[PDB]
Design a protein around this ligand. Structure first.
Ligand SMILES: Nc1nc(O)c2nn(-c3cccc(C(=O)O)c3)nc2n1
Ligand SMILES: Nc1nc(O)c2nn(-c3cccc(C(=O)O)c3)nc2n1
Ligand SMILES: Nc1nc(O)c2nn(-c3cccc(C(=O)O)c3)nc2n1
Ligand SMILES: Nc1nc(O)c2nn(-c3cccc(C(=O)O)c3)nc2n1
Ligand SMILES: Nc1nc(O)c2nn(-c3cccc(C(=O)O)c3)nc2n1
Ligand SMILES: Nc1nc(O)c2nn(-c3cccc(C(=O)O)c3)nc2n1
Ligand SMILES: Nc1nc(O)c2nn(-c3cccc(C(=O)O)c3)nc2n1
Ligand SMILES: Nc1nc(O)c2nn(-c3cccc(C(=O)O)c3)nc2n1
Lengths: 121, 121, 121, 121, 121, 121, 121, 121
């Protein structure tokens, strides 16, 4: 089953980061969420109730990304994957990628971050 | 067999969407279609009749994307994959990705959508 | 005097638009604000009080762009230019460009909008 | 008066070109239309009737770009500028830029074309 | 073994295409070549003779892409893969992707093409 | 008169540069050529003979850019502007911009170069 | 005289900013430097000594951008323009644009900054 | 286990290359480093000590990329992968991609390079 639902390049201004200064100033966090979901039924029916509403997923991500500031992106992706797997039984597995495009790292690069894949139990 | 034929970033202005307002105003839909097809024979012959004409595939996609407005992208990708698998025996499997780059979702993101892979029976 | 202060590609999700459907669903609005300001004194002093804080300008723009929904972009740029010229005597003239990258217009284009230049009296 | 209304990156698939082959195969034409229009009244009123509807301009451009095939881009921009100046008294001057991003020219480049500015008499 | 050598976005102006008009006018062809090659020895030695010179591969591709005009991209990728596998024993397998970014297809899209993977025997 | 004919992002692989090493290895040169030409007549007639053929201009540029290696971009733009003004009486003035996107300068930047504007006498 | 020498998108990682946190963490600063210089002589001669070496200008910019941390971009552009006008008599005027693509401003935007133009006395 | 830590588009100006001229002039090298690391613990704890600090990895890469000039990219990726696997037991495997976007190859392309994947023993 290779069907997926996806939300790309979601950006939120937040205050997460292990450094005090980072928590103070804040920065933009880029998030990509890919959900493994069997889409044939919805493909047949055309009924929104046979799939996972992308609008509701974005809201879950947002609440976590624009909420209390944590230290790691690992913690942020872990709470997102957990929150999506929990509320949707149709999601067989959740992949969350978080990118810090402008971290306190003295150099020239496009971005830094992590990516986790969590199966829904 | 890893051979493929592909059509990338196909854009159509349509009126699909579960929301009334969406059906009224319309929006741009981005479509990516990848076909698993053994290309060696055509590679040997150089005869167009030994492969799948990308121009004809785009027309099939277009007719579905610029046609009657449905509610889901799942339904739109399902009719496309079904239409391509049906008319071409050479297509062993069809992958359709549809992106709503500007959905009625209050936020900052690059796009939202779905992707399905359908084997030709 | 060719000195300027600028804020580029500011994006806000709003509900402005002459169409009911637009007010209902909303869309992303891109804003570019260029201010004619003599920057030599601040260039000499390095004192933030000798110039116009970009952070405060963005807040003014934001309040107008994410506030009550109006019909025209002309009205939106007119309230922004007026609000910036009013609070900053150092701004000799204000230029506001607003882009609707995804308007209810059935077609393929990069964006549509307006640009106004308002001298501070 | 530096106020303008603009439509950027409008793309149409057409068959214009001095070469037979070009008229046969067709190609994508990129169009940028900038209109000099005093936007203060609409800025004050917020009444759509005090400005020029971008949606109607795009339709005029479209009809010309997706219509009968001519030889030059100069002829295409000349009919567009003439058509916009003619129907809108509020347009003090019209600028039309047309780009052939993929012309029958053996080389590596981003695009080729012309740009005309026509005052409304 | 996941080591590779790659040449991305190689562009050539050519006259391949099943349509007469295409052979007459020509167009830009984009090529991506990925070679599976064990790179540890060269990684240890730092001796150019322990790997495959990207400069020589580009020349092989070029000669095929800017040479006699054929009908299919399948034929073009097949001659490239065959030419690289043949001259380099170190290449365990060759992947060739060819894109027609501007084909005689009336529509809006990023590109069309094919991709083949050929193991070196 | 604000009419122009333009050729953007023309790229050529050359060996110009004041450094020996540069003449040896070569690099990509980006060229932008803008011609001031009254386009109304061609706009009226639709006759290619009433304007300046972009295809012929690109050839002139090419011959200069892919020809003998000189030291400066100033010399390269000067020979191009001179060559275009000379062969076309319709060109009232020629603007040539040349960019070295990858010069032997140890740093991070998008490009370096020059731009000249030459009136046709 | 419309001749210019330019250095675009120069990026440096620095610690300038009116906020303590900014001085602590640092960020990327984008710089664009345009010099008004008569390029005809160098265009005629092809002698590097008849123009301004872009490599030397980048070094001046770099030393200022990667040096002691100041509060304003105005101060940074003022020292750059002053340093270039001072060492080169051939530079009739210097334009310096500095962009903070990731400032401590809670929002979604492409960048913020200033631009100054300084004539060489 | 599909968890990863990544550093994308890291750019360094260096003097590696099999050609004398290349060692003399230097060029920009683009590096992408992907690390397979189990991120659940850090995801649970939010403790930086339960993961691999991206800032420290960038420093290791930098020291190798901006250090002594070698002939191959294979040698450069091999020393990076080896250096990261060596200092971090948490890294189960390291993938290093190096791109020469502007090599001494007479042609039009986006880039050339290699990619290696090295398991940590
Ligand atoms: N522009 C903008 N919009 C929002 O909705 C924001 N929410 N936060 C925000 C507030 C408090 C904490 C965080 C956080 O990421 O921890 C984010 N910054 C914003 N900026
Ligand atoms: N510009 C443009 N071109 C076309 O070919 C279009 N077809 N539709 C269209 C018409 C009716 C229904 C749909 C739909 O997607 O349901 C699309 N909008 C277009 N715009
Ligand atoms: N994501 C996001 N963030 C904000 O700060 C928003 N503000 N509005 C908003 C709310 C009410 C009216 C408007 C408007 O533009 O008229 C905008 N939508 C948002 N989405
Ligand atoms: N995809 C697409 N959509 C349209 O609305 C088109 N109109 N034409 C078209 C038809 C006849 C003549 C021309 C022309 O440009 O001369 C264009 N090609 C299209 N493709
Ligand atoms: N600009 C440019 N440079 C080259 O090296 C070219 N080679 N061909 C070319 C010539 C003959 C046949 C083909 C072909 O692709 O069949 C290509 N067009 C070029 N343009
Ligand atoms: N790929 C490619 N195509 C061409 O037409 C080229 N011409 N030159 C070339 C040859 C001799 C001198 C110069 C020069 O720029 O001085 C350029 N390199 C090329 N590469
Ligand atoms: N990667 C990198 N390279 C350099 O040359 C740097 N110079 N500085 C630097 C050091 C001290 C002060 C500043 C400053 O901008 O004030 C910058 N950070 C760098 N990072
Ligand atoms: N701008 C810039 N910044 C640095 O930190 C650099 N380090 N090197 C450098 C110096 C010596 C050898 C190499 C090399 O790559 O072999 C690189 N060039 C730089 N440019």
């Amino acid at each position: 089953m290779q069907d997926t639902i996806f939300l790309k390049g979601m950006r939120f201004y937040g205050y997460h980061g292990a450094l005090s200064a980072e928590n103070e100033i804040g920065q933009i966090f880029k998030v990509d969420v890919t959900l493994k979901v069997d889409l044939s039924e919805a493909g047949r029916t055309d009924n929104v109730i046979d799939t996972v509403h992308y609008g509701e997923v974005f809201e879950e991500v947002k609440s976590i990304m624009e909420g209390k500031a944590v230290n790691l992106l690992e913690h942020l992706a872990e709470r997102i994957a957990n929150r999506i797997n929990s509320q949707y039984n149709r999601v067989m597995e959740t992949k969350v990628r978080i990118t810090k495009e402008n971290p306190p790292i003295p150099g020239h690069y496009d971005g830094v971050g992590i990516e986790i894949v969590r199966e829904n139990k």
